[PDB]
Amino acid sequence: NAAIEVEKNNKGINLSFDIEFYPNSFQILQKEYKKIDLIAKLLEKFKKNNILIEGHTEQFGLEEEMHELSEKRARAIGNYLIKMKVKDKDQILFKGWGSQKAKNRRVEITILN
Amino acid sequence: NAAIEVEKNNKGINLSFDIEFYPNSFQILQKEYKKIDLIAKLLEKFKKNNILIEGHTEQFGLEEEMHELSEKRARAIGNYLIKMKVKDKDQILFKGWGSQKAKNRRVEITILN
Fold first, then answer.
1. Per-residue burial over B89-102, b = 16 or more CB atoms within 10 Å of its CB, e = otherwise
2. Which residues of B touch A41 (CB under 8 A)?
3. Cα separation of B15 and A3, whole Å?
4. CATH code at B1-113
5. What's the first-to-final CA gap in chain B, in angstroms?
6. Can you give the residue ranges of the OmpA-like domain (chains A, B) (predicted)?
7. Among A27, A16, A26, residue whose Cα is nearest residue A67
């Protein structure tokens, strides 16, 4: 669960992992920042690349509500990467899938070609 | 099974994955080179780092025989990385664990601090 799963696709290099969020929130648990720090170490080395951050929910709530929550989760991750100075806001696309694709929730980050 | 698992430790950034070798051999199946190419894409970006490649066997054979086989598996991976020009021989440590730690066998590569 501490590991990032890395796989190539047609879009770039996919980083798939799971981040504990507090229930029904886009707030990252304190202990998870070290995992994002590892992600930051990889992204730092792909200096010129743009990234895509994709968020997800699990609950079958109203679609706009789930979309918003899932996007705010992607943004919480992106914001930390901004703060760590590994990417600029210029370089980050944020996508929420809602629920369409225990606190652990799926996040993907793609290092875009 | 196509994914590399990435996790940080005290030694550096650990890349754990599994490579199909032909039974009792250190020959990599043709289809696996694309996976090593992905590893190469990551290593390319950690230009200054030395790496450690660790090989493993599963059979409970004679310890020196298993050690040799496991080390030759690490070397097969390293040799391809040399050939792809992502690392020089100067930068690669090779370690065989034999069996002490379906064709799929465990390999680890650590991007050393």
1. eebbebbbbbeeee
2. 8, 13
3. 9
4. 3.30.1330.60
5. 27
6. 8-113
7. A26
Q: How far apart are the first and last CA of chain A?
A: 27
What CA–CA distance (Å, rounded) separates B38 from B30? 15
Distance from CA of A45 to the nearest CA of B (A): 6
Q: What is the DSSP string of A42-57?
A: HHHHS-S--EEEEE--
How far apart CA A60 and CA A28 sit, in angstroms, is 21
How many residues are given for chain B? 113
User: Is the torsion defined by CA of B99, B33, A40, A101 positive or negative?
Assistant: negative
Instruction: Judge whether A90 and A41 are in contact, CB under 8 Å.
Output: no
B6: contact with A, CB 8 A cutoff: yes
Provide the experimental method for this PDB entry: X-ray
Radius of gyration of chain B (CA): 13
Beta strands at A51-55 and A92-96: parallel, antiparallel or unpaired: parallel
Structure token digits, residue A84: 């760590």
